[PDB]
Amino acid sequence: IEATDDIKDDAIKTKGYFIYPSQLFCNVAAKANTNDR
Amino acid sequence: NLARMNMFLHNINYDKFDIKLGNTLTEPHFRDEKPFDAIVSNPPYSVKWIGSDDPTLINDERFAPAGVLAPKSKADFAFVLHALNYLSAKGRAAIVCFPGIFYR
Amino acid sequence: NFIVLDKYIKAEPTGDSYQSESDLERELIQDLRNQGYEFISVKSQSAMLANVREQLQNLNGVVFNDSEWRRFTEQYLDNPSDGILDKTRKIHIDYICDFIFDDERLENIYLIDKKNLMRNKVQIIQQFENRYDVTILVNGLPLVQIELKKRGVAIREAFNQIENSLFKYLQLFVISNGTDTRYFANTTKRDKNSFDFTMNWAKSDNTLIKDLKDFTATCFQKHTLLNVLVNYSVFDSSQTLLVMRPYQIAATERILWKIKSSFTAKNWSKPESGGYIWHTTGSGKTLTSFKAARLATELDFIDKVFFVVDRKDLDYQTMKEYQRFSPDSVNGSENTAGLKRNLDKDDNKIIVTTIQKLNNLMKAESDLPVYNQQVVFIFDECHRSQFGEAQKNLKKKFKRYYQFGFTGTPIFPENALGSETTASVFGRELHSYVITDAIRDEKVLKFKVDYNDVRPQFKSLETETDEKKLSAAENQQAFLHPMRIQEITQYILNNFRQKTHRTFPGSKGFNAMLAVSSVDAAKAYYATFKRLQEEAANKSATYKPLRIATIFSFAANEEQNAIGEISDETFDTSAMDSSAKEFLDAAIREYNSHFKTNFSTDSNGFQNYYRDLAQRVKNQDIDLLIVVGMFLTGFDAPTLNTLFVDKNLRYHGLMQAFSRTNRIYDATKTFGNIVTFRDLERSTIDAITLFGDKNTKNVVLEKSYTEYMEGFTDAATGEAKRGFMTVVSELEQRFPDPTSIESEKEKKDFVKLFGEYLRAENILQNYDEFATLKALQQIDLSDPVAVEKFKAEHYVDDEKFAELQTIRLPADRKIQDYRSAYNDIRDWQRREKDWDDVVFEVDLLKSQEINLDYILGLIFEHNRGEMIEEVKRLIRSSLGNRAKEGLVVDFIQQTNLDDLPDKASIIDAFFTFAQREQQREAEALIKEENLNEDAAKRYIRTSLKREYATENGTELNETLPKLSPLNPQYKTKKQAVFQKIVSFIEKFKGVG
Amino acid sequence: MTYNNVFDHAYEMLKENIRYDDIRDTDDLHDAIHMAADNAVPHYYADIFSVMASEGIDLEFEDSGLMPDTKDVIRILQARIYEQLTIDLWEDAEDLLNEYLEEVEE
Amino acid sequence: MTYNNVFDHAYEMLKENIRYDDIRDTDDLHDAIHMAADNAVPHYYADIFSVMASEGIDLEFEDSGLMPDTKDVIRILQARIYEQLTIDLWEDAEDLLNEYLEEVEE
Amino acid sequence: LNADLNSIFVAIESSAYGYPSEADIKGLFADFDTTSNRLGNTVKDKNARLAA
């Protein structure tokens, strides 16, 4: 998803966009619930 | 699960690259897709299954050209009878077995 | 008292309006309160838990504190990781918890009192808090979930409309809309395999009960609901909750009632005590006998339950009975001391044995200790080859038994040949499930018996009723006259592609059988095919021939039974004479010569030949199979719709013979074409007389030709159908013919009519006279060569010829016009997305496809630019070919017919031109959007090998040009390029 | 992974041999015992040690000549398993002299 | 009953010896290693087989001369356990050259 | 008690070990019979096994 500015993300999900990596990757967790987070 | 993440870690994509849970002998899938171009295997030793057959699969879809079917404790040569099924004329199979075959 | 009801008074509302879901919900709740289900109100998970606690304390008689109840809830009842399967196993296996009280004692907390069902307490709730749902609690645990739907929503789509903790306990989902009612088993699947399994509750004579009122009055009785949900549902291992169809639950409770009411009379071992179930063959008969035997064990006074079969099924049901472990029904061999050990190996007293092992038990031993106990036998597959003397031995050397039998082949006093009836052996017909019900259940399909009345020379012989002369006329004259065989064979080779829906080359079709009487007949039949395929090849050399084989061994061994069955055929190739063995070997050599095999004529080569022959029919390799006796009981295929008969099929060998056709496939296949060549209609009526009334032939077989031509009112369902010619008149007299459809109501009414037209046409195509009437549209007139060949094919005198000239079909170009209009409606209302009301007909229009071959044939044969319009509407007649419109047009707007020398070369010329423009258009699609070139080339060729595209498989998104994985992006040029490439792959689907 | 698991495998395999070969001479029966015996022994390290920590079989011998005079320890252990199984197949031969061959008469 | 249980017993016993004897010469330290080594090995059949089916220790050798040329199998196995423990007590000697003797200064 | 062959349920004997180990008068040498337990996987299998 960086492919670029902010390492630390936030709940800005805009879930119409969310289905595109769910088709592309189908491991679509969050922006604030990762192992770095 | 660890196999499904094993091929997930190595940057393999999403759509095609799968494992199905279950016994290969009793519930194979895919039958339809296809006679393959390359199968590899490493069947574990002593993977017995009750026969011979416990179902009516003596007259199954794939073990009919064998004539007789493999008993419980010698289930390794079941795999090779499974092996020539899912394989085209172009295909080749590289399987492994126990050495101790005289004629068994 | 039963739960599959015999007599039910059909109740009715007034109404009390029957439309809205609020109405259905209020009326259902009121009716369940009237049946004694307590209605409560719960607004939380915790109050559900408190109710559960109160009900368990009321049942078990124990009292908790908050410590014990917290430990029991967190430890057994509501463990958080445990999914749906764990809860279902807890209802069906682990329904007792060992529990340690705090005053240091151990008791057994039940959940479901499975031996006295009345002690359970039921409650009802609704959900909190869109859907309108009715949940039924058993002792506070939710098990049954009723959903309600909009009445316009068809149930097949209504199925597709799919904290907390206790709602993992659900078993039965009942779905309904006020009109239809089905019930699932624990949230298995989705639309792809949807209504394979969704049953309907019924009465005891298999008449379905569909509306919500009678379903509530009959299924939701407390006794019946608890008894079905607990005592008749198998949690098999694993991922399997099996709920029995109601004709099974019928037979099971008849069995147990007959036992439990014979033991009070103390009336064992005599032919009025037993009885028999008669199922159809192949409906899931294992589970019925399993549950009957398992509930037969758990009567207290019943000691031993034997479960006998015929050879050599024993290991298979020794698995299937063990699919719910563990009934200990083990018999590897008759160690007679080991068998009486198994008689003495106690506590699990269901025994699977052959008739041979029990037979030798009665032979060898004579004074066993078990012969005075309470013994219940259950039999299966009672064809009379291994059954006779063992019943006499069982009547001799036993003292107390009840014998029950399942069957598919009953015997009646209507039958004969010195045998003894089932009722004089078993007793009452306890309950039966015949093919008429399965027809009404839409599980199998209807018949169509036809007598091909075409030969006046032999009409006396093919209609004689004297069975003595039916046997006596077996020679080379009465049945094996050569012109008889030739005219039958000519009929087959002229109407094979018509009956089996192969009138079009791009169509799929089906394939048939051919049953004959003797081997000496069948040799002449196969040689006649062998000669006439050559003679047909010597006329045009364009005729596609047929792949034909045969099999037969041995023999009409004994008389062995009553009238009248297929002889049980064995595998001894050495048992025949020299001639049939020689012919069989020659046929197998011709078989191997094309299929590249080495099946021999020993036991093993013939066995493997049979085991492959049953595989190659199933995937449309062989198109016709000459048959004496085989494949008439055990064979089963979904693409075999046609049985040609020259045989004396009688009473219920006839039913098995006809039943090899009508297994369901899709909306295209509708019923099974039996084409006979002897007098069999009276035999058919006399055979279906054995089932029941004379309404039966109005349900089983088929309506006549004129009744589909004209229109009728059905005496079976009270509908008023419109037939065919009325629909044809409605085509013209309701439309601005043919292509002037613009408003919404015009489009909707045209679809609603023309789908009915396609459906009626597909029913008509099996007939004879509609084939003649379609043949009349293609004739030369006059040209009495053509008219004489016409009347030679179709056997029409000139009065009937002019009469068929009177009746006017619509023009074929008009059919092209309306088909193209229907296809345009379909493609215009595929995009976005009032139209989502009527399902378009697809599978009919999925057929009649032209895969460019007949297109290139018309392009080659045309002489003489002017033809460019015609294909321009021929391409609008086939869905899935709309993109190749511009392709073929630009093939003929660039090259001339002089560029191609003949028909067979312009094919590869078209493929060459297609690839040459394909390369340029691929380069254009790459250049237009500046992609990742080799990556997108790999994507395009992969999608061509895969014949579609998708957003899945991110390598497409690896062809995104420089920067678009990012969230602040339009992601719209992505979808635009996706539309470009799906346009491209449709533009070349099938060429490469 | 008991000794009795291996003995059940050997018992089943010997039943297979006698059932499918119809051997009624006791010397050929004991040749079939030699067939089933090594064909039933395990091969893994931990399996052989878990069998040797189990009942029935003992570390002590019936014939020290079956030991190969060599430094291959699990060969010696597997020979000991072979030896205990040959004794237990003498007992199984006494069972199957009267178990299966009597019923097969048709 | 791992190998590491036996190694923990040997580690504890070697700590006892070095702690209560105050041995600061490495040859006498290895004599105390020989003291602790056989005093830590097990004696039962099933215990020795469960150690030999465990990790760390291998059937292969460091010196074949420790094998007694005899038909006493668990003597050979116990010698193998002794040998692997002597190697692991070389490592433990490398630990205890700097573990305990440094603190005791008063 | 062994006249009740395959009688539901188990815990009767767990009661029949409750009281004879009470016997608190005098000088017990009881507090004893607490090794018979419940496993087992299912309670019907426990009943069948203890009956065996």
- Domain borders along chain E are 2-102
Q: How far is CA C389 from CA C386, C506, C568, E90, in A?
A: 8, 58, 19, 84
Residue C556 to residue C568: CA distance in whole angstroms: 8
- Is C890 inside any structural domain? no
**Domain shared by C670 and C537, yes or no:** yes
Chain E residues close to D71, C-beta within 8 Å: 61, 64, 67
Query: How far is it, in rounded angstroms, from Cα E18 to Cα E31?
Result: 11
Contact C268/C401 with Cβ under 8 angstroms?
Answer: yes
Distance between CA atoms of residues C858 and C974, nearest Å: 41
Nearest to C797 by CA among C788, C784, C806: C788
Min distance D12 CA to chain C CA atoms (Å) = 12
The rounded distance, in Å, linking the Cα atoms of C191 and C155 is 11
CATH number, domain of C322, equals: 3.40.50.300
Q: Find the residue in A nearest to C957 (Cα).
A: A24
Domain harbouring C776, CATH code: 1.10.10.2110
Residue C881, phi then psi, degrees to nearest 5: -125, 10
F6 and C347 within 8 Å at the Cβ level: the answer is: yes
What length does chain A have?
37
Residue C618: CB atoms within 10 A of its CB come to: 17
SS3 of C950-984: the string is CCCCCCCHHHCCCCCCCCCCCCHHHHHHHHHHHHH
Which member of E53, E71, E74 has the closest CB to residue D64? Answer: E71
Asked which of C242, C275, C304 is the last residue of a domain, the reply is C242
C74 & C55 share domain: yes
The angstrom resolution of this structure is 4.0
* Rounded-to-integer distance, Cα E20 and Cα B10, Å: 56
Q: Which residues contact C86 (CB under 8 A, 6 or more apart)?
A: C79
Q: Is F10 exposed, middle or buried (0-12, 13-18, 19+ CB in 10 A)?
A: buried
**At least 3 CB pairs under 8 A between chains F and A:** no
Residue from C129, C169, C186 nearest C49 by CA? C169
What the block records as the tokens of C626 is: 């000459």
Q: CA-nearest residue of chain F to C347?
A: F6
Q: Are residues C421 and C451 in the same domain?
A: no
Beta-carbon contacts of C518 under 8 Å, excluding residues fewer than 6 positions away, are: C474, C628
Contact present, C644 and C515 (Cβ < 8 Å): yes
Cβ–Cβ contact B14 with A under 8 A: yes
Q: Report yes or no: B67 at the C interface, CB cutoff 8 Å.
A: yes
Q: Does B71 touch chain D (CB under 8 A)?
A: yes
Residue numbers in the known binding site of C for ATP are: 279-286
DSSP code per residue over C140-155: TEEEEEEEE--TTS-H
Phi first, then psi, for residue C454 (nearest 5°) are -135, -15
Binding residues of C, by number, are 279-286
- Could you give the angle at the alpha carbon of C476 between the alpha carbons of C475 and C477, nearest 5°? 90
Question: What residues contact C192, with CB distance under 8 A and at least 6 apart?
Answer: none
Pick from D13, D38, D43: CB nearest B73? D13
Of C952, C966, C967, the CB nearest to A23: C952
Which residues in chain A have Cβ-Cβ distances shorter than 8 Å to C952? Answer: 23-24
Residue D44, both tokens: 């893994």
For chain F, how far is it from start to end, CA to CA, in angstroms? 13
Q: Which CATH superfamily is domain D2-102 in?
A: DNA mimic ocr (1.20.120.780)
DSSP-based helix, strand, coil % in chain E, nearest 5: 65, 0, 35
In angstroms, how far is CA C86 from the centroid of its own chain? 32
Asked if the structure places residue C11 within a domain, the reply is yes
Assigned domain for C938 exists: no
Say if C853 falls within a structural domain. Answer: no
List the single residue in C with minimal CA-CA distance to B61: C615
- Cis peptide preceding B8, ω within 30 of 0: no
Give the CATH number of the domain where residue C91 resides: 3.90.640.50
Phi-psi category of residue E66: left, alpha or beta, with phi > 0 → left and psi -120 to 50 → alpha: alpha
Q: How far apart are CA B82 and CA B99, in angstroms?
A: 19
C331 lies in the same domain as C407: yes
C-alpha angle with apex C716: C711 to C720, nearest 5 degrees? 30
- Whether residue C25 contacts residue C134, with contact meaning beta carbons closer than 8 Å, is answered with yes
Classify E28 as helix, strand or coil: helix
> Nearest CA to CA, how far is E28 from chain D (Å)?
32
b/e burial code for range C290-313 (CB count within 10 A of at least 16 → b): bbbbbbbbeeeebbbbbbbbbeee
Choose from C333, C341, C356, C359 for mutation: most chain D CBs within 10 A: C333
Containing domain of residue C772, as a range? 767-808
Instruction: Mutation target for C interface from B23, B56, B63, B85: give the one with most C CBs within 10 A.
Output: B56
- Tokens (6 digits) for C664: 């369901």
Residue C960 lies inside a defined structural domain of this protein: no
Which residues, including other chains, have CB under 8 Å from residue C311's CB and lie 6 or more apart?
Answer: C354, C355, C356, C386
Whole-angstrom Cα distance, residue E11 to residue C253? 72
Alpha helices of C404-466 — where are they, by DSSP H?
435-440
Q: Which amino acid is at C223?
A: H
**How distant is the Cα of A23 from the closest Cα of chain B, in angstroms?**
9
Q: Which of C540, C485, C541, C542 is nearest to C517 (CA)?
A: C485
Number of domains in chain C: 6
Chains with 3 or more CB pairs closer than 8 angstroms to C? A, B, D, F
> How many CA within 13 A on the CB side of residue C588?
23
Give CA–CA dist C402/C269, Å, rounded: 6
Partners of residue C955 in chain B, C-beta under 8 Å = 13
Same domain, C221 and C252: no
The torsion angles phi and psi of C596, rounded to 5 degrees, stand at 60, 45
A1·C951 Cβ contact <8 A: no
Chain E residues with CB under 8 Å of a chain D CB are 45-46, 49-50, 52-53, 59, 61, 64, 67, 71, 73-74, 76-77, 80
Which residues from chain C sit within 8 angstroms of residue D103, using beta carbons?
333-335
CA–CA dist C932, C943 (Å, integer): 16
